[PDB]
Design a protein around this ligand. Sequence first.
Ligand SMILES: Nc1ncnc2c1ncn2[C@@H]1O[C@H](COP(=O)(O)OP(=O)(O)O)[C@@H](O)[C@H]1O
Ligand SMILES: [Mg+2]
Ligand SMILES: [Mg+2]
Lengths: 1009, 1009
Amino acid sequence: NPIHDRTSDYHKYLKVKQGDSDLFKLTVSDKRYIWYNPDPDERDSYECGEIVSETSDSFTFKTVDGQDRQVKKDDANQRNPIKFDGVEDMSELSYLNEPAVFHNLRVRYNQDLIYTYSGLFLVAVNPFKRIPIYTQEMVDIFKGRRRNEVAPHIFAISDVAYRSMLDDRQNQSLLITGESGAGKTENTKKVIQYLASVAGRNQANGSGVLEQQILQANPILEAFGNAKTTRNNNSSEFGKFIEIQFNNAGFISGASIQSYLLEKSRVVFQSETERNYHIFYQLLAGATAEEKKALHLAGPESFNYLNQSGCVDIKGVSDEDEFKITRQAMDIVGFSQEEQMSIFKIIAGILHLGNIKFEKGAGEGAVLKDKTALNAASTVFGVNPSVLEKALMEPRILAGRDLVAQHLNVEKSSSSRDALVKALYGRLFLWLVKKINNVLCSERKAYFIGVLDISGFEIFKVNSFEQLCINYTNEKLQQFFNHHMFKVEQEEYLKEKINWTFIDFGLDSQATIDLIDGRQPPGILALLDEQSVFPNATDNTLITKLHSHFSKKNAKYEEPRFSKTEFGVTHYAGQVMYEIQDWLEKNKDPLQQDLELCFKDSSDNVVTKLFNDPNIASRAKKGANFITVAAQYKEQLASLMATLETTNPHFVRCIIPNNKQLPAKLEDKVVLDQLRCNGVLEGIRITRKGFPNRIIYADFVKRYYLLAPNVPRDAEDSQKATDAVLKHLNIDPEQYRFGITKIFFRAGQLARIEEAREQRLGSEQTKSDYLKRANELVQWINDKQASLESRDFGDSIESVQSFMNAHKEYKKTEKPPKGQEVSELEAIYNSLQTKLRLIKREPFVAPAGLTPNEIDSTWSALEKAEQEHAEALRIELKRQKKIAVLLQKYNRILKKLENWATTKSVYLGSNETGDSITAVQAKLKNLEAFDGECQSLEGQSNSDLLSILAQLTELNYNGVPELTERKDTFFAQQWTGVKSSAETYKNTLLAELERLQKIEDLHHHHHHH
Amino acid sequence: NPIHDRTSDYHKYLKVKQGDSDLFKLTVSDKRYIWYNPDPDERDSYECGEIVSETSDSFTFKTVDGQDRQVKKDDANQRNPIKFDGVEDMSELSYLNEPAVFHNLRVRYNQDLIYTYSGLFLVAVNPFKRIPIYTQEMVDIFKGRRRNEVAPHIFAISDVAYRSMLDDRQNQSLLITGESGAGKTENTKKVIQYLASVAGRNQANGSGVLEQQILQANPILEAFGNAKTTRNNNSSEFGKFIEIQFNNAGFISGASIQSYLLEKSRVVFQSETERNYHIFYQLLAGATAEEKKALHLAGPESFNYLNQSGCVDIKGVSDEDEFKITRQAMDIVGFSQEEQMSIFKIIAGILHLGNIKFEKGAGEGAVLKDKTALNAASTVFGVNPSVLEKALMEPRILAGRDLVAQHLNVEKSSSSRDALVKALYGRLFLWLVKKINNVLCSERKAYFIGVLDISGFEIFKVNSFEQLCINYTNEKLQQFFNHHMFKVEQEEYLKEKINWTFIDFGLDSQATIDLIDGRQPPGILALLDEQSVFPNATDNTLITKLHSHFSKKNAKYEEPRFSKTEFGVTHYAGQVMYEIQDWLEKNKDPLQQDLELCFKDSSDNVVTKLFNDPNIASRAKKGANFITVAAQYKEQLASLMATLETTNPHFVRCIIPNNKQLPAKLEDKVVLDQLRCNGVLEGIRITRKGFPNRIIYADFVKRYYLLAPNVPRDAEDSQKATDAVLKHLNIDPEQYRFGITKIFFRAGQLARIEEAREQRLGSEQTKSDYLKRANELVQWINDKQASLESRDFGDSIESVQSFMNAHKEYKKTEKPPKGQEVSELEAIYNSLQTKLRLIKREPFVAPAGLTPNEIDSTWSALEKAEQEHAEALRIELKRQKKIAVLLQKYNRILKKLENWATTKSVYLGSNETGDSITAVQAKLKNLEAFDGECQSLEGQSNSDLLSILAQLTELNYNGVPELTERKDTFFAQQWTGVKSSAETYKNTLLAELERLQKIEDLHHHHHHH
Ligand SMILES: Nc1ncnc2c1ncn2[C@@H]1O[C@H](COP(=O)(O)OP(=O)(O)O)[C@@H](O)[C@H]1O
Ligand SMILES: [Mg+2]
Ligand SMILES: [Mg+2]
């Protein structure tokens, strides 16, 4: 059950990658967008702009670029809310418009999700690269699962088809259409792969080989009906309706194949760059030396029918390999070696017949001055070259009741040949289908599931008769789908008992169908049949009859105002201009009776059977002039339609992402056009009209319960819980209906409800972010103010200035950003308060100080603290400076006395030279001039030192102590040391005067002696 | 014998479309053309023109309009004469020009002849289409044949080399070089195909196993070493040297292989349009569903290494078919099933590593959010995703002396991963190779022929290190060639005994070689090895070092003025600018050691060998250091040149016809360039120096005998005959040299001679056209004259007048033409004489009658007959109308008479009022007045007419008798009528009177009564 496991490959390749979260907080954006085209030029180009504002009935938006535009709500293409991105079914989109539909497709495509539903439709966009979603594991995941129980997938459509066959005992059909290269044939194989798998009986020697034969039939038909073209390297050049037959118990019992419009013209002509049918290249490449010589085979390089396109290989294909694969298929299906060799002989013959050169000769008739080709053809075909040569250039025409030989010229003889080839090829292809059916088809069958694999409407620059046939066929399928849609859609409205009925519908295709295949009056196909049987008549006598029958007489017809070879009918997908050129002959598909007679006698089993069995060599039977081509097709389609009408249909629409076969390249012009012609968009325009969104009450409540007062997500009465929400959101009661199991919504209503939920959660996310930002801001202010209220500033002149320098910094750098925030939060606050006003919710009541008013006051306070901090600094610089002048003075005074305490230390400590009372004592008159100055130099200095100290003290200068000490230490030291020194100078210089008074009088005692 | 049978395949596919008459019938034109540049713009584009008239200094030629340009005879490029077109060997051309060499190559390529010789070279142009020349029948044609015995072919070179081996007991080598997609690999396959046919042990017990393997090794290497590029869908991204080993007897006994410069960068990156190596695509496409969910495989575009170019497929190739072929081939060679899954797991891992997405981490380093890839990679590789995650993002460096892990920024995280991938790829390839060599190689080999499949000189927009390795290699090889060419050239002159000395021309091949691999002084590689091991050395540091070592010094080196990151070296093929970016990293080729450890401990058998076996994981350790990539290469090239110099070599040059991989489009610009670089044009420049053209004597005479008087096609003495032709044509004996077996000529000489053969044949033809036109002319002139001289111009005016108008027409229609012819045959005769003088032979002398001078006279005579003719006509019309007037006069006369007689015949037939003798005899007088005039008319008239008859007889009017009779009748018819008739009237009047006067007489008797 990998269905439930985000890691399984089923989730990896078939489910939209989610962020694995169910709760909330997943939506961080809730804006409303609108899809618009910048330049009204490119209608398919789209941009989405944010809805700026809206009026009573008209939005106004901001183009992704700049300028604003306005549109009336009526034409507005609103973008669906993000939850709708990637929905598995377009029907789940609330806003149902073209760019919306395309957007969802893009979203899924960029994730490699290629299958998506759209109502009854399974849309499948070609990925142009292999994606691993077709493994056996994937197959097993889809068994018995229901359409809405698993992701979109070709396998899901197949299983539902199968279960319905069983559970309803009714036939089913898978109608797969779309452009060339869109992926029809690949999905068609997948459908059959799935069926062979879940309903094929195992072994038992012969019961399980059947499943092998069915699957192997396609390889065969593909080789002969497929070719490389500018649009597809493996283009299908024929319609195909496979029918898988089942028995009562539900097991595969057989299958039959139906072929349509095989483009035979490709066998003789290829547009540059294309290739002929695959077998041609497969044979010339895979053949063996014997086979090559026996068939006179050469190389592509040497065959007209194979060497005019300048292309003989295909990207990634080995024609050698293919041949073997094709041979193997024929083996399993039961083709005998005889038959195969006969088949490859015809392919060989056709090649040679194209190498027959018809030159002009004497008589301006037609000659064949060479036989190589002719002989080679004849040899493999099994017919004498003489008759063939005759039947080619001189066919025997019947003039009355007697036949006489004619002589075609060159170009008329060439065509005759071209027609034998086209005839030979068409009949061989039919033989194969017939042969295959003989082995696989069971005459009696309980039920069957058919798969129609054919192109949708074709509209080239030149549309011929082949084009009218296919567009006619799609007119019928489209009508068949319109009838089924309105059927299945009405049964939905009854099941749920919703009283609603359509009144629009989409103008039927009946009128156009008739303009083409009408009886009375005669349609385009009737006339062409009439105009192609009346003797002398050409293309120009045909269109003329058409103009006169329809121009200005039928609304679906048109006679071009600038051409007389074309005419146009208005099909579902738009008007197509058909070129009348060659229609008469195309509807006649002519082959010389002589050529039939010739090959009618071929010695080959298969060849002779191609010209003898009327069920293959001729059309129906009128009783004179066999049914025409157009008449034959009309009959086949009539048959196909009658079969489909006895089945329960399933529609798969294939889309090509671009015209360059590129992966990862979804182009809007290309996609949108396809969606405007395949019915997908017409389908949405129709259902959009009623109640397109249907949700099962419980699922509704599980998601929107929180929009109503007290309902639980798992409310026990879902229907009543749903009414609660609808009422509370005051939704317009006309916008919905209470179905039996689901709640119905008109277009846009669901989106509006989903927007409400986004607005809600957005409302709370904003509320949340604001609180976080409001706090982070208040906090920042509280912290800065704290810092600014401090008064440290430290203590020097450079210290305070570094703080003044910081404050200038925080005002230029930090303040501004914090200021923006204040006014930005106020903006947010008011927006939220207003948003909450609508949204029908309680007003916002913020915490203590997170109101825009309180944040304003809180900010005014920080501004007031910023100033007081500023004033505090200037005043502290004043002080700090004063302190520096007083400190300088102090230091100076001491640096003074200190120096004097050394200068005068050289005075006291420095004596004289000479003993007596002249050079000794008669000098100490200076000492009295000394201690007279060093008694004032103290009384004046210490007086200043103190006066300075008191001041510093008055400036609460915490540094006074160490000052007063350095001072006190000085005086009680250096100063006294030298102050006392003056003793050993006044006492020692009066002591040596003892020996100048005592030893002085020994020479004074001579005046007595 | 296919060789001599103008209807066999050999002659249809390998021989120019010849003829069967060596006699005289193939050279109708004798005009000498020249090769010029229509627009001086393109140097390699040419146009041929006619030679006006040379001078004893230069030429003069007419373009393809009337732009007669003149060119220095010593500069001109003459076009060889038709006989040289298609020669199997370029050296047989006389005029050796570039446009001349190209023309020959083109004449042959246009007939699908892709092989041509040029000296020792075998030139092979890619045909881009299949040509039936490689079948076993073709193979058989070459056994024991000499290069000159059969047509040019890759098979001839192969056999010659194989004979030389067995004959000389000497090893051989075939060197195949050329641009990408030139066809090097295809021809290498042929050489081997062929060697297996002539030397493979037929097919004994298990003998036909070795060769079965030697062949199977290719699919293997090509699967891992080839890829689709803009130039080749199967480009070999590596060079190789195959060695086919044979025993004593010539039996193949083994094979060895060697790879060179495998471009590892491709595994992680590819340009728009290109693909990664083939296996990546083969695996994803050919893996069985189990293998797919064992290696975690997915589609091509799901892998980064595979979805960056936009291309995932190849024309005509099926990656699943190829994968099967690769596996199948691996079995034949020996890879056990185990090994094979090991190889695919590594290929798978590399792919997975590519998806590991690194992204900006929580900080600045890198982190890995999604672990899917990483885990997948680890799973197949067999390693702990735990350590793998660390080794990639947090590698342990050895900073200091410890192991301090790191954290690389997202950018450097991816590089390391890109480094691991490349290391992983290079080692696997190198491993596959050794494994193949284990099975095929044998140390006991009697001899060997080695085939070198490698690219030629590369010169791209941006050239890097790899380009240098390749251009250096081609420097050696081109020097190896020149040594072998000099050696062989003197051999031809010595034998044959011609005294001639050539130069050695190799004086700068060493100059370029040394500038690159030089040691002292150090060459670019020496400075890169050094710089590569200098701390902090950067790319811009190496470019600067390179500049101060060679810029403005070594004449082969060059410093661009604009680019700072580029530098240029002059190679053999031209200046090559090399970008320095990344060289230091390339030469070092690092790989985080932690990433070595993580894998060293791999659980996988193969992975282990790749990281543990030093023979694979390492370049080679000198112990003290490792060998740089440059050194490693240097030694491998050395080993190769070593082997190649122990062999007799054969050189093949592949050329690509254009840059669009299309057939039938040989383009001058493209081809010439290659011829100019691969050494072919050079060789021709040198070969042009001595004596290029050398013809066998008897062969020369057999063709140019007619040039020398009386020399027979045969001659017992071919030399004397040759001389008699050279002397007679007067030729400078410095322009040739008598060899012993053949005669040698200098460039341009054999052509001049052939131009003389042309001119004689032309003369002879002119001389024939002349007579055919002269004889016809005179025979015509002669007849008009005999015509004009006739004088029978009929009889009335009309007759003569018609001849006058006929003479008028003649002079305006039939004459002018014959006039020019007269004067044009003169010019032809004059010119013819001038020419006959230069060819050196007898002057022309026309038969009696024919010749300008005699023709003039014959025409003068006609011019006279014309004038005498007109005069005769003039004088005859005079006589004719002169006769007309007389004829009129004559008739008028007879008319009067007739109409008169008729009137006087009525009168003579009635007598109604003659009743009176008076009225009657009076009426008889009127009858006498009648006989009066009737007489004077019968006389005058007959006299007039008679005078007219005499006048006519003077004009020789032969119609006289016829006129007379007419006359003599009247006067015996009508005239004698009236005359007699007159009497009837008279004989009645006479009577009615006579028989009345009788009454009147007897009645007159009334006189009495
Ligand atoms: N589902 C797919 N997965 C991979 N390739 C696809 C798928 N569908 C289509 N393609 C590609 O488109 C090509 C055309 O598809 P096809 O079915 O042939 O187109 P149609 O049938 O409409 O003409 C394929 O052959 C293939 O290359
Ligand atoms: Mg199809
Ligand atoms: Mg190659």
